Design a protein around this ligand. Sequence first.
Ligand SMILES: [Ca+2]
Length: 100
Amino acid sequence: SPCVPLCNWTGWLDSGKPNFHKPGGDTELIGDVCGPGWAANISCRATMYPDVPIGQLGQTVVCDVSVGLICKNEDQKPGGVIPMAFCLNYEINVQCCECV
Ligand SMILES: [Ca+2]
């Protein structure tokens, strides 16, 4: 008697955030969490940019379809058009496959 995985979106979630200790460094890795070697859909956004892929706002982040999000701004950048610096809280939504 086997089970059958149900690939559902986790909902927008957030492992790591700038208000924790350092601004950039938002690494939300699903790949080694839900099942290393999966193939499912990811959506990467910022709370203030829910429509726009985070790189487009002038960011250097990599929200990768095989592993999850990787926000790491190493090069300093003061100022902005948002009252926040580079690499701000980002979040992902991934469609991982589970049964209960
Ligand atoms: Ca985050």
